[PDB]
């Protein structure tokens, strides 16, 4: 429960994978609405580390543009230079993309991104143990979800195709 704001009570159901963090650049605003970015069937990129170099960000956008589908970028943080590339390809021709930082604050974010990847179906990037360098990503290496919406101060993932048996096993892990 939270401190209400209206005359009456309210029962809200936060469904999907949603979190308090908003889209970084206000150039992805394709909603024609209150600061939203709406994508349908978009790919996902999931890096545990930041995204600084243009060489790092470039192949993901290459794969996305080849498939011609919108892309979400859930990572630690976006370089101003890769951000500049993004805004360049967004203001003009308009490669459907969007940038958001990591939801979890600390150690929690590592588990949260792992769960997000396994929910959407894919693989976290920036790993320590295998480390999954961004230079060699693959069309089955991206997070895939039915629908994504981003506000300036939260975003939601919907229909992540993440191997329901696998997410089941993850659930069993965390429940034990």
């Amino acid at each position: 429960v939270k401190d209400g704001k209206t005359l009456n009570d309210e029962l809200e159901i936060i469904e999907g994978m949603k979190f308090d963090r908003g889209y970084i650049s206000p150039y992805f605003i394709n909603t024609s609405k209150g600061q939203k970015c709406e994508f349908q069937d978009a790919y996902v990129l999931l890096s545990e580390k930041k995204i600084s170099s243009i060489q790092s960000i470039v192949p993901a956008l290459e794969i996305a543009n080849a498939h011609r589908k919108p892309l979400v970028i859930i990572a630690e943080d976006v370089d101003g230079e890769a951000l500049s590339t993004l805004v360049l390809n967004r203001l003009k021709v308009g490669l459907q993309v969007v940038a958001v930082k990591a939801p979890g604050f600390g150690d929690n974010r590592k588990n949260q991104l792992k769960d997000m990847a396994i929910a959407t179906g894919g693989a976290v990037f920036g790993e320590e143990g295998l480390t999954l360098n961004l230079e060699d990503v693959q069309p089955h290496d991206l997070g895939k979800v039915g629908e994504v919406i981003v506000t300036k101060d939260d975003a939601m993932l919907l229909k992540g195709k993440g191997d329901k048996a696998q997410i089941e096993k993850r659930i069993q892990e965390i429940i034990e």
């Binding site: 543009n65 080849a66 230079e81 390809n89």
Partner: protein, 100 residues
């Protein structure tokens, strides 16, 4: 030594010109200008007379005009001709020659 639009280097120099800036990627993405450094593949536009530093007779410059070369990184003088900036390097500084 061969000259250019009222310009000629001196005894060691090689005036050349970088290629384009390579804005877009190969496949489907485009890159900004603040990135991508300075294109290190260049073409030679004019050549100095020759290395007079050679004992007695002077030494002719090897890389002939019209060649694609692998530029060095730091050494070089930015000169302007007709508001077209060219780069003047030293003959010993050129890395590779794109022979073909």
């Amino acid at each position: 030594g061969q000259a250019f639009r009222k310009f000629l280097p001196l005894f060691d120099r090689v005036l050349v010109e970088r290629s384009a800036a390579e804005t877009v990627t190969k496949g489907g993405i485009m890159l900004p200008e603040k990135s991508q450094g300075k294109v290190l593949q260049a073409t030679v536009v004019a050549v100095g007379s020759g290395s007079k530093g050679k004992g007695g007779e002077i030494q002719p410059v090897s890389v002939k005009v019209g060649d694609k070369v692998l530029l060095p990184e730091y050494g070089g003088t930015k000169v302007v001709l007709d508001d077209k900036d060219y780069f003047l390097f030293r003959d010993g500084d050129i890395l590779g020659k794109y022979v073909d």
